[PDB]
Amino acid sequence: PISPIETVPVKLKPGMDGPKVKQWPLTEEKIKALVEICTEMEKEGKISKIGPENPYNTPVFAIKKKDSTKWRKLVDFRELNKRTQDFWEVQLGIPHPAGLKKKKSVTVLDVGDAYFSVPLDEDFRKYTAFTIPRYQYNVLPQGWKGSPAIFQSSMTKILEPFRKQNPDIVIYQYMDDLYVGSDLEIGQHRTKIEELRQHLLRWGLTTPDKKHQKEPPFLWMGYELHPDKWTVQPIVLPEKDSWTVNDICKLVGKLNWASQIYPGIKVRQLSKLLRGTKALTEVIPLTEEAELELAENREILKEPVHGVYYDPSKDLIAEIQKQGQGQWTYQIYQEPFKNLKTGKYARMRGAHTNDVKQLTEAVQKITTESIVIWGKTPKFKLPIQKETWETWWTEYWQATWIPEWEFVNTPPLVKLWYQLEKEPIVGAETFYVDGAANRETKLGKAGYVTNRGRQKVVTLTDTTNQKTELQAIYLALQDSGLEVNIVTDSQYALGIIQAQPDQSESELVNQIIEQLIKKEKVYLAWVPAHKGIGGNEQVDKLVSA
Amino acid sequence: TVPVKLKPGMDGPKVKQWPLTEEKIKALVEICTEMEKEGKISKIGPENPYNTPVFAIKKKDSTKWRKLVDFRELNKRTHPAGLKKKKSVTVLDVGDAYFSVPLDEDFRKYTAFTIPSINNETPGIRYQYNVLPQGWKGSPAIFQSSMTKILEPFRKQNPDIVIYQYMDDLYVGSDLEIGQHRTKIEELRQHLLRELHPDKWTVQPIVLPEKDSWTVNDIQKLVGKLNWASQIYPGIKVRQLSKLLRGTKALTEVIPLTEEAELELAENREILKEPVHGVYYDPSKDLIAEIQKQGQGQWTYQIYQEPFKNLKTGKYARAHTNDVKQLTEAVQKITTESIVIWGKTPKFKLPIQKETWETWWTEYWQATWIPEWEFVNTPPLVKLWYQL
DNA sequence: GGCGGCGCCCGAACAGGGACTG
DNA sequence: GTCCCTGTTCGGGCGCCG
Ligand SMILES: Nc1ccn([C@H]2CC[C@@H](COP(=O)(O)OP(=O)(O)OP(=O)(O)O)O2)c(=O)n1
Numbered sequence: 001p002i003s004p005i006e007t008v009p010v011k012l013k014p015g016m017d018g019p020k021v022k023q024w025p026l027t028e029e030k031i032k033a034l035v036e037i038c039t040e041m042e043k044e045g046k047i048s049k050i051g052p053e054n055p056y057n058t059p060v061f062a063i064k065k066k067d068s069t070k071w072r073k074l075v076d077f078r079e080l081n082k083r084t085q086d087f088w089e090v091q092l093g094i095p096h097p098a099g100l101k102k103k104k105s106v107t108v109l110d111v112g113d114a115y116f117s118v119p120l121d122e123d124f125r126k127y128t129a130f131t132i133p134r135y136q137y138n139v140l141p142q143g144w145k146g147s148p149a150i151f152q153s154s155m156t157k158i159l160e161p162f163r164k165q166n167p168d169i170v171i172y173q174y175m176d177d178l179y180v181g182s183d184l185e186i187g188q189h190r191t192k193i194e195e196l197r198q199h200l201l202r203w204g205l206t207t208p209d210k211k212h213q214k215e216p217p218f219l220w221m222g223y224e225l226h227p228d229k230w231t232v233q234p235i236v237l238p239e240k241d242s243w244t245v246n247d248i249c250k251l252v253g254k255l256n257w258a259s260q261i262y263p264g265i266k267v268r269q270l271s272k273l274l275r276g277t278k279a280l281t282e283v284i285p286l287t288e289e290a291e292l293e294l295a296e297n298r299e300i301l302k303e304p305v306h307g308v309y310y311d312p313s314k315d316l317i318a319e320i321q322k323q324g325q326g327q328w329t330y331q332i333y334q335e336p337f338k339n340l341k342t343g344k345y346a347r348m349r350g351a352h353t354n355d356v357k358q359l360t361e362a363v364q365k366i367t368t369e370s371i372v373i374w375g376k377t378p379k380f381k382l383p384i385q386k387e388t389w390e391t392w393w394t395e396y397w398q399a400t401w402i403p404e405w406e407f408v409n410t411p412p413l414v415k416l417w418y419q420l421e422k423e424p425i426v427g428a429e430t431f432y433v434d435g436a437a438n439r440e441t442k443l444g445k446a447g448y449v450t451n452r453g454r455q456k457v458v459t460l461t462d463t464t465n466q467k468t469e470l471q472a473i474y475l476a477l478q479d480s481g482l483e484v485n486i487v488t489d490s491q492y493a494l495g496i497i498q499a500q501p502d503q504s505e506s507e508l509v510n511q512i513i514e515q516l517i518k519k520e521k522v523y524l525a526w527v528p529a530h531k532g533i534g535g536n537e538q539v540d541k542l543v544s545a
Numbered sequence: 546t547v548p549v550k551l552k553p554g555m556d557g558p559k560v561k562q563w564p565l566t567e568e569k570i571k572a573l574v575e576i577c578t579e580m581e582k583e584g585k586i587s588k589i590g591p592e593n594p595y596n597t598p599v600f601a602i603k604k605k606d607s608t609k610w611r612k613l614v615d616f617r618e619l620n621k622r623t624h625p626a627g628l629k630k631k632k633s634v635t636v637l638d639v640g641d642a643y644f645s646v647p648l649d650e651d652f653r654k655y656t657a658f659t660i661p662s663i664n665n666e667t668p669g670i671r672y673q674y675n676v677l678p679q680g681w682k683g684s685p686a687i688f689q690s691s692m693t694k695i696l697e698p699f700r701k702q703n704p705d706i707v708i709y710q711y712m713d714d715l716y717v718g719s720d721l722e723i724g725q726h727r728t729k730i731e732e733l734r735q736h737l738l739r740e741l742h743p744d745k746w747t748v749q750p751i752v753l754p755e756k757d758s759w760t761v762n763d764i765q766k767l768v769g770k771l772n773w774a775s776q777i778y779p780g781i782k783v784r785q786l787s788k789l790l791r792g793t794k795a796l797t798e799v800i801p802l803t804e805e806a807e808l809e810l811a812e813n814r815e816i817l818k819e820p821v822h823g824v825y826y827d828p829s830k831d832l833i834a835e836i837q838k839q840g841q842g843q844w845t846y847q848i849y850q851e852p853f854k855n856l857k858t859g860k861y862a863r864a865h866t867n868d869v870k871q872l873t874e875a876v877q878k879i880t881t882e883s884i885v886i887w888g889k890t891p892k893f894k895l896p897i898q899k900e901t902w903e904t905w906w907t908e909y910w911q912a913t914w915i916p917e918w919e920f921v922n923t924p925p926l927v928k929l930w931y932q933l
Numbered sequence: 934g935g936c937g938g939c940g941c942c943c944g945a946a947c948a949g950g951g952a953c954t955g
Numbered sequence: 956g957t958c959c960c961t962g963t964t965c966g967g968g969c970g971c972c973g
């Protein structure tokens with residue numbers, strides 16, 4: 001039936017007008033399905049026969065539904081959508097089973113032909129015109145950009161009084177999918193379910209009996225809900241011989257979907273396989289690291305996994321582990337070996353970075369994801385020494401902070417692989433470095449002058465001033481012993497190196513990092529260029545030619 | 546009602562709501578039920594295409610939560626110089642009064658907000674304001690007439706007390722002694738129901754090392770600092786000190802300061818003691834406030850409008866310390882200073898990654914307003930230059 | 934082959950700052 | 956000014972849900 005709720009006032013954008021688009025030819029199957037649907041909808045008041053006074057049209061078509069022998073009528077409303085006012089979406093996100101608390105009794109309801117039970121603004125119906133090889137919509141259509149928001153809000157309004165007088169019953173509301181949980185006995189629960197279904201009826205919403213689940217395991221939002229466990233509906237990865245960009249996109253999307261409950265999923269190398277591509281049909285040969293990463297993911301997926309349900313009275317604990325190459329896995333649990341859920345973080349921020357930075361980024365991702373699913377920050381267990389963190393917190397010139405955390409020594413550990421000195425080292429040879437690069441010819445020079453009288457200048461091709469300053473620092477590091485003072489004229493290089501990086505997109509910064517690690521003491525100092533200072537003056541005169 | 550339009554060619558705010566903890570959400574639901582019953586807000590739908598993020602803060606030692614709407618975007622699209630010079634200035638919340646004046650009907654759509662739900666159990670519940678929203682830069686503007694009417698007799702009978710309205714609260718200033726001041730503020734509170742000491746706010750200068758043994762490194766550092774400084778005080782000379790480094794020496798080598806060089810250093814210290822030349826406040830341009838983390842819970846800041854023309858410089862000083870919390874207390878102190886001095890909040894350049902600040906800043910926010918901010922990666926030379 | 938929500942990942946477009954030319 | 960480097964944003968693939 002049609003809901004008696006008020007309709008949402010809806011307008012076109014100013015100066016705009018309805019769509020006039022011809023009707024594509026559909027197969028005999030789609031035409032039969034569409035006439036069988038439309039005759040009944042017009043009988044029911046959901047569409048109205050229209051005539052020459054409606055100068056509008058939009059193409060319709062059909063697709064087989066979820067898995068059933070039933071059909072879905074869609075309208076390619078792209079035009080009308082480009083010409084319809086903006087909406088504010090109310091679906092702020094997707095619910096997750098890990099945020100569900102254990103309930104004694106549980107049922108999942110579906111609403112039948114959902115959109116088609118919510119009415120449509122009377123002034124707006126004309127624009128929804130269509131034809132079959134001519135009706136207009138009186139209810140929410142599928143393909144119109146405003147239907148999801150108007151439906152979700154209408155269903156919120158309908159459920160409002162029931163919730164208001166049934167606070168002990170949880171109704172998780174994804175668009176027309178209702179999860180209903182209670183601590184009532186099966187009998188009282190099924191009676192309250194009946195009250196709910198009658199309520200939805202008074203507001204025009206049928207809950208079909210075929211789509212009514214009453215017994216575990218419930219299929220819900222992509223998962224299987226058991227009384228004490230939840231699992232993910234089976235994830236089947238493609239086993240292609242040759243791979244195309246679209247195929248790796250499907251693969252990595254399915255691995256990302258798995259990463260919520262399968263621990264240790266990694267996509268770094270499969271993701272790299274998409275760097276330079278230009279076509280969803282282009283073929284990509286796997287690397288060897290791609291082979292290994294995908295094999296590992298498959299061997300993970302071949303194992304039986306499950307999550308559990310939240311207990312608000314216990315503590316949320318999030319525990320993080322370092323994978324290779326800026327990738328991280330985490331597990332959120334409450335009791336030692338029984339995960340609420342799992343996840344991964346592998347977002348590569350910054351040209352140069354260290355593990356302490358990535359670990360912080362991961363901690364705040366987990367924090368926001370947990371605020372969403374439970375409304376609570378977790379207690380963290382990180383592979384980083386309180387001393388490492390305190391050292392970094394002290395010597396790092398930006399504000400950084402991590403919530404309550406405790407240390408676990410499941411390696412690999414998070415370490416600052418080197419520490420710049422605060423004061424210059426007595427007796428250590430003192431290196432004044434510099435570099436220059438001709439902007440026209442891309443030629444350059446880099447080198448050092450020391451206090452003991454050592455000089456060096458290497459010539460470089462196809463470089464830039466920044467690259468050549470870093471080359472100078474690298475020169476000093478190579479030709480010095482375990483303790484060295486270095487004086488540079490570039491804030492760029494100084495600023496990279498004081499961040500204490502342990503990885504870099506640049507090969508030169510990687511080589512510099514290896515040299516810094518080898519050293520026992522390094523002291524880096526900055527002088528203003530072109531000022532006639534110290535040895536800066538002579539190395540500057542030396543690398544210009 | 547007072548009709549309100551927007552700045553021309555601008556459209557209403559469309560800012561997504563951010564996550565809220567369970568206790569903030571619970572307070573927001575309680576507060577918005579009470580506010581809807583009293584007609585101050587009304588449930589709306591998705592056909593209002595506008596949105597503004599909402600959250601809640603806790604009262605100092607009280608257990609009442611305050612609803613805080615972040616109207617920075619809506620404000621973007623819509624003062625006595627003697628206040629700085631008073632002995633005591635008290636900040637006094639008056640935003641509640643704005644809930645008596647209705648809001649222009651055609652404009653109420655721009656105030657919409659969306660309360661979220663844990664785990665997305667329900668779509669967000671949208672509301673709009675029907676009365677003057679607190680946090681909006683239009684509420685004190687409209688309510689100015691009624692406030693002037695309210696304070697006419699108090700201002701008359703207390704001609705030496707300075708009252709300045711900024712968005713949701715009054716700033717009441719006097720040269721009185723703390724006891725008399727407290728009494729008069731209570732007089733004003735009782736009358737209106739129909740702390741800070743800005744004379745002690747001083748300028749944190751730029752200071753140079755004083756020491757009796759200088760090394761090549763120390764003098765290189767000093768020359769770098771003075772070089773960066775001459776871009777502010779153009780009378781700073783470095784010639785002699787820079788001469789003291791001729792050659793290629795070890796950083797640890799001691800370098801005795803010559804008479805000429807020591808005279809250069811003394812005259813440089815004197816120069817730094819002078820006020821900056823040619824810094825005029827422009828009330829059309831926006832205030833920039835830059836912050837540097839100096840470690841040990843010590844923060845430096847500079848308020849300016851054009852580079853090197855600093856209007857104010859200062860410090861914030863405060864075991865189990867929280868960097869983010871110290872930073873939000875810092876920006877709140879700097880903003881209160883700017884609202885006393887210039888009647889205008891600054892645009893902050895925060896030395897923090899956007900995600901850390903955005904996760905945690907609301908946990909520590911205490912004031913009704915919210916300033917503009919950008920996030921920046923500080924060049925370490927600047928922290929080096931403004932440090933103490 | 935239509936829509937909205939959230940997720941990931943990559944690249945294009947842009948902003949901003951430091952260093953440099955004659 | 957130009958060039959070089961770095962960071963953020965946004966949109967377009969795909970995934971998942973209805
Ligand atoms: N591919 C899809 C699937 C769903 N929906 C929208 C239309 C209303 C709701 C449909 O959910 P279904 O589970 O398909 O239910 P239905 O349309 O009400 O039909 P049924 O009677 O089979 O539940 O979400 C959509 O726009 N596009």
Ligand SMILES: [Mg+2]
Pocket residue numbers: 110111112113114176
């Ligand atoms: Mg349905």
